[PDB]
Amino acid sequence: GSHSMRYFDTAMSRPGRGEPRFISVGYVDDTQFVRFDSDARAPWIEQEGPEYWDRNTQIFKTNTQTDRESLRNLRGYYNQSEAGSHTLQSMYGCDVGPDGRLLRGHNQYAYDGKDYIALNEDLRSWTAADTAAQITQRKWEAARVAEQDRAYLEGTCVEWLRRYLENGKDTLERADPPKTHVTHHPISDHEATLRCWALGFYPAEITLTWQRDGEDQTQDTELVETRPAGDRTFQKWAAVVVPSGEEQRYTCHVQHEGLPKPLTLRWEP
């Protein structure tokens, strides 16, 4: 199907405990393939040269310094003291369709958890969150940064994502369907919980819903966040509280990429 490549970078100052830590992690969809950590690889990555690895190592080193200097600049923009710790995050990368062509590129930043600046979908213009980010925007417009970012996103990003998908196809292009069952747990004489499970699926995207008499139970469904199992796969469950004796009015519905057709499940006593 469709795929994404995304880098998640975190720079965090720590006054009195050295220079800010910089960590960059790269993903294809829900598979991490690279990590660089200033505080010191997928198999289909090792098959690239040691030259590929050096070139990316150099980039990580330069990025470390750029984000460190940016943290300094940002505390200035917000009139902040040197005493506190602050965080600069960024996400960049590309989404492609089944044919491998660019759907959309991304390059955006947050400071202390708050959106700061983002490259617009046009890959030519910026959206700044506040008067500080407007400084960054003006500097980046003057230095024609968006043109460099666009070149990466339309070129390097798409080209390498295509290569990774080809070299890592047995995993990256394999969707593993959820294994599903419904469990039943009495709460009292009067009510029981029905819990619909999805286990062992990849990628993480999934839809799990309960219906009662064919009606969506959005407000009455407890949905846990999709969670990693540790073996590349993910897990999720959805639960509803039902009156004793009424269990057969409830159906669990599962949609996932690895499924030929959606599942409809009920409790089977």
Added chain:
Amino acid sequence: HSKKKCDEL
């Protein structure tokens, strides 16, 4: 493949 961040904010 990573992208150079060569411009300070």
Added chain:
Amino acid sequence: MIQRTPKIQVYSRHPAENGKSNFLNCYVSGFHPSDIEVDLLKNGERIEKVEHSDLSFSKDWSFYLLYYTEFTPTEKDEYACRVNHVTLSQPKIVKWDRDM
């Protein structure tokens, strides 16, 4: 500044079966800033053999980490995850429940 408190889930990699080697997971997510302390507990004592994933975050910028260790569940051993974060007055403890 905004801070976000961690969500915590404690669970096994594979369906739990007493006597069978498995992995105990504690997934912490939705938190900001990124500094966090996570311990896996066996009958109240800290497990020494604990690994974690590399720091990453979701599209809403909140961080997540998976902490994990090999374990062989039994009928009577109690497992839990203990989490501290700047947003918590004291460590939060979530018990491992096979049905969640």
